[PDB]
Amino acid sequence: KGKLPPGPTPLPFIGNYLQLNTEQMYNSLMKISERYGPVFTIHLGPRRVVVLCGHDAVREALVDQAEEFSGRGEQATFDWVFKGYGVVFSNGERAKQLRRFSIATLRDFGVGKRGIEERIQEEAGFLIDALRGTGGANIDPTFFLSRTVSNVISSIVFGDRFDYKDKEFLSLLRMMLGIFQFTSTSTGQLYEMFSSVMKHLPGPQQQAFQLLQGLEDFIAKKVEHNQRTLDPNSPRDFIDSFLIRMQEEEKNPNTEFYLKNLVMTTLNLFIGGTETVSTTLRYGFLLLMKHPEVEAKVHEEIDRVIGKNRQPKFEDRAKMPYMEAVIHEIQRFGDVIPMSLARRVKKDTKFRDFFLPKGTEVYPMLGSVLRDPSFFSNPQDFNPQHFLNEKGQFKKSDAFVPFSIGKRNCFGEGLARMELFLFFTTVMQNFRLKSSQSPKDIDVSPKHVGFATIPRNYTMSFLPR
Ligand code: HEM
Ligand SMILES: O=c1ccc2ccccc2o1
């Protein structure tokens, strides 16, 4: 045909706003998909976006035409502070440079190696101490989890961990939780369509901007301190490494290594490496309380393979297919970043007999892949069997895409998987979970879904085993 994917007819400026519900963007798009097909065009306000639903559409685009779909689209709330700088929201040469440097630097600081594994085990031990500190009292686990997770990436980018009592640290965590919540609310999704007017109006979006500004200021302050104490031959952390590269590049007028990219990249890693893992852990504990029989099975596996004395280690995962299926099912059910981060076609593109002009934004509907009925027997239920064959051995799924896929996929994926495995296992090895309500009354549907999937607020107690 040589035309853009079909879709509902947009009105000037507002796009398809009248055919969408900002409080349930995912459901609004899936409903429209029923009518036009798995690949369709929607106009989010003035943004023309091709929506990809289901495994096949998503993989065909992001992997089979990986380079064509390798551009970065927008997320308006985040672009307010990033403005196209930094590794996540950048494009072209800038993205290419900052991504290659970031992956290399994370490796030099132990990601994917024994170095970061010992750092995560150590922090997991601090989480255990903190949980024993509650004496089995009913608590809100939110910041217990985020403080522990954040300290792993914080160790890498800032050189050391924050004290759990540090009040500025809790402040930063509140900013991150606050921004993920805002981008998942109806106003946050309304902002994705009308940022051109809303960025200048009073409202919830202004408080979200202040949380972002708060985080940027904190990073700019840490960078200044590292700067006036830097040893060019002995970097302490990600920031120092970047400063060193910036020194070497001072003679290149076209370098991507300058202050703004350092501040934005560091902020991307601090937020990306904190809130995503935190939200997954929080959701998973709630899911385990709703499903006690699954927790029991996890406990049997942990006691048999690891026992009660030594700390879990990452290699233990090879011997624990059940725990591996459970963590996969938590990320599949949790669907933390349901519409991924927008992509954009790098050049004029032919996709399934559709025409996608260069620059077209793309919404890979990750949640529609994680719940594809063609890949999981009961997509709407929490069931670790989705990741186990008949003998209870771990079984991979091509529809397991919570870190997305393709050329701009999550490069924090290895760190996240190690954190998820070591934190879930070390906590479950030491405690059994007690909910404040009968498992039948636990509501695991999400509190908000937009940019992220946020689970409902809850309290629980960690009882020593
Ligand atoms: C359970 C945890 C996590 C989930 C579900 C997750 C999810 C994602 C997703 C869906 C994307 C967009 C991929 C795309 O455009 O195709 C992404 C990108 C990214 N993630 Fe993660 N992530 C997680 C953890 C992490 C961690 C721990 C870090 C930090 C080290 C991190 C850093 C990044 C970065 C820098 C990008 C942007 C890559 C680029 O634009 O080239 N993520 N992540
Ligand atoms: O700055 C950011 C904001 C959101 C996000 C989500 C997943 C991975 C990395 C991210 O970085």
Curated annotation (Swiss-Prot):
<dbReference type="GO" id="GO:0008392">
    <property type="term" value="F:arachidonate epoxygenase activity"/>
</dbReference>
<dbReference type="InterPro" id="IPR036396">
    <property type="entry name" value="Cyt_P450_sf"/>
</dbReference>
<dbReference type="InterPro" id="IPR002401">
    <property type="entry name" value="Cyt_P450_E_grp-I"/>
</dbReference>
<feature type="binding site" description="axial binding residue">
    <location>
        <position position="410"/>
    </location>
    <ligand>
        <name>heme</name>
    </ligand>
</feature>
<keyword id="KW-0492">Microsome</keyword>
<dbReference type="GO" id="GO:0005881">
    <property type="term" value="C:cytoplasmic microtubule"/>
</dbReference>
<dbReference type="InterPro" id="IPR050182">
    <property type="entry name" value="Cytochrome_P450_fam2"/>
</dbReference>
<feature type="binding site">
    <location>
        <position position="268"/>
    </location>
    <ligand>
        <name>substrate</name>
    </ligand>
</feature>
<keyword id="KW-0349">Heme</keyword>
<protein>
    <recommendedName>
        <fullName>Cytochrome P450 2A6</fullName>
        <ecNumber>1.14.14.-</ecNumber>
    </recommendedName>
</protein>
<dbReference type="InterPro" id="IPR017972">
    <property type="entry name" value="Cyt_P450_CS"/>
</dbReference>
<dbReference type="GO" id="GO:0009804">
    <property type="term" value="P:coumarin metabolic process"/>
</dbReference>
<keyword id="KW-0503">Monooxygenase</keyword>
<dbReference type="GO" id="GO:0005737">
    <property type="term" value="C:cytoplasm"/>
</dbReference>
<dbReference type="GO" id="GO:0020037">
    <property type="term" value="F:heme binding"/>
</dbReference>
<keyword id="KW-0479">Metal-binding</keyword>
<dbReference type="GO" id="GO:0019373">
    <property type="term" value="P:epoxygenase P450 pathway"/>
</dbReference>
<keyword id="KW-0256">Endoplasmic reticulum</keyword>
<dbReference type="InterPro" id="IPR001128">
    <property type="entry name" value="Cyt_P450"/>
</dbReference>
<dbReference type="InterPro" id="IPR008067">
    <property type="entry name" value="Cyt_P450_E_grp-I_CYP2A-like"/>
</dbReference>
<keyword id="KW-0408">Iron</keyword>
<dbReference type="GO" id="GO:0005789">
    <property type="term" value="C:endoplasmic reticulum membrane"/>
</dbReference>
<dbReference type="GO" id="GO:0042178">
    <property type="term" value="P:xenobiotic catabolic process"/>
</dbReference>
<keyword id="KW-0560">Oxidoreductase</keyword>
<comment type="function">
    <text>Exhibits a high coumarin 7-hydroxylase activity. Can act in the hydroxylation of the anti-cancer drugs cyclophosphamide and ifosphamide. Competent in the metabolic activation of aflatoxin B1. Constitutes the major nicotine C-oxidase. Acts as a 1,4-cineole 2-exo-monooxygenase. Possesses low phenacetin O-deethylation activity.</text>
</comment>
<keyword id="KW-0443">Lipid metabolism</keyword>
<dbReference type="GO" id="GO:0043231">
    <property type="term" value="C:intracellular membrane-bounded organelle"/>
</dbReference>
<dbReference type="GO" id="GO:0008202">
    <property type="term" value="P:steroid metabolic process"/>
</dbReference>
<dbReference type="GO" id="GO:0019899">
    <property type="term" value="F:enzyme binding"/>
</dbReference>
<dbReference type="GO" id="GO:0005506">
    <property type="term" value="F:iron ion binding"/>
</dbReference>
<dbReference type="GO" id="GO:0046226">
    <property type="term" value="P:coumarin catabolic process"/>
</dbReference>
<dbReference type="GO" id="GO:0008389">
    <property type="term" value="F:coumarin 7-hydroxylase activity"/>
</dbReference>
<feature type="binding site">
    <location>
        <position position="78"/>
    </location>
    <ligand>
        <name>substrate</name>
    </ligand>
</feature>
<dbReference type="GO" id="GO:0016712">
    <property type="term" value="F:oxidoreductase activity, acting on paired donors, with incorporation or reduction of molecular oxygen, reduced flavin or flavoprotein as one donor, and incorporation of one atom of oxygen"/>
</dbReference>
<comment type="similarity">
    <text>Belongs to the cytochrome P450 family.</text>
</comment>
<keyword id="KW-0472">Membrane</keyword>
<keyword id="KW-0521">NADP</keyword>
<dbReference type="Pfam" id="PF00067">
    <property type="entry name" value="p450"/>
</dbReference>
<dbReference type="GO" id="GO:0006805">
    <property type="term" value="P:xenobiotic metabolic process"/>
</dbReference>
